[PDB]
Amino acid sequence: ISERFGTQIRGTDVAIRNANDGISLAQVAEGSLTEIGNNLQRVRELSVQ
Amino acid sequence: QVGANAGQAIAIDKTIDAKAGSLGTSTFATGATAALAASTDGARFSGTVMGVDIGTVEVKAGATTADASKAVATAINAKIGEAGIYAEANSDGTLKLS
Amino acid sequence: ASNATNSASDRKALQAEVTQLVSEIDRVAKQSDFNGTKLLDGTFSSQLF
Amino acid sequence: SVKEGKAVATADIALMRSDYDATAKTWGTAAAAGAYTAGTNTSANVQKL
Amino acid sequence: DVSTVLGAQQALEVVDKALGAINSTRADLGAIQNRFTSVVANLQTSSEN
């Protein structure tokens, strides 16, 4: 039982690490999409004229 | 992988395809013609476009195809806020609607 | 989303997050155990200590 | 009905449609407009949100 | 194209569609981020116990 508990704890740590990496990936993608949107807004304001 | 055992994982399906060659695809209906070539004496034109009346117009006795084309184009363009159709005149006497 | 000033797009945007949360609830409920004995899925019979 | 587990029967709705006309009229009353039907109930849980 | 009137009148519509798509994707990514945060918190508590 002690070995099984040890395996569970050691797995849990690296699981936390993997989840954090996923968070970072999402952050980067959203950061780029923001600038895409800003440029589109400028083009539309230009084209109304 | 978010678990300590085989088979415990979640997935991300897809984000977006944001290349400028495949963003905001759309279609517009176009290709209108009239084939109008009336001449000689003047006339009054009536009728409805897309369920909206456009009033009446009048041309002089010495009318020509170019004379009537521009009058009808003006009458159509007067109500772009409701019909949503843009009309362009043509030299021969036809019209193009987009 | 029960107000009257919203539109279809906003309701879809809210429904997306509702769906993600429901899936998370289901996964947590189905993947919980103590020493290989599943607890919260309705198979916990009488146990004697 | 937006209230859980509430029973509405045929007698719970009583619409006295009246005043059929108004030309030397509008005096008189009736019910009309049907009474009710027996549509089946709809069940719900967390998954079907 | 903007050098004529029709170019502008159709640029308005194409830009509207692009903005709609961008906003929907941003909403999806935000939902994913929230789910990952919840997962991390649950993992921490379980490991400690």
Resolution in angstroms comes to 3.3
Select from B2, B4, B15 the Cβ nearest to the Cβ of A19: B2
Residues in B 6-45 with any Cβ partner in E closer than 8 A: 10, 12, 15-16, 18, 23-26, 28
Q: Residue D2 has which token pair?
A: 């937006």
Contacts of B28 (CB under 8 A, 6+ apart): B98, E10
- Radius of gyration in angstroms for the set of CA atoms belonging to chain A, rounded to a whole number: 22
Q: CA nearest E15: which of C7, B26, B30, C13?
A: B26
> Dihedral of the CA atoms A21, A26, A29, A32 (nearest 10)?
-100
Q: CA nearest B71: which of B51, B33, B42, B48?
A: B42
Select from E28, E30, E35 the Cβ nearest to the Cβ of C24: E35
Are B39 and B46 a contacting pair, CB within 8 Å? Answer: no
Method of determination is: cryo-EM
Q: Check CB contact under 8 Å for A19 and E11.
A: no
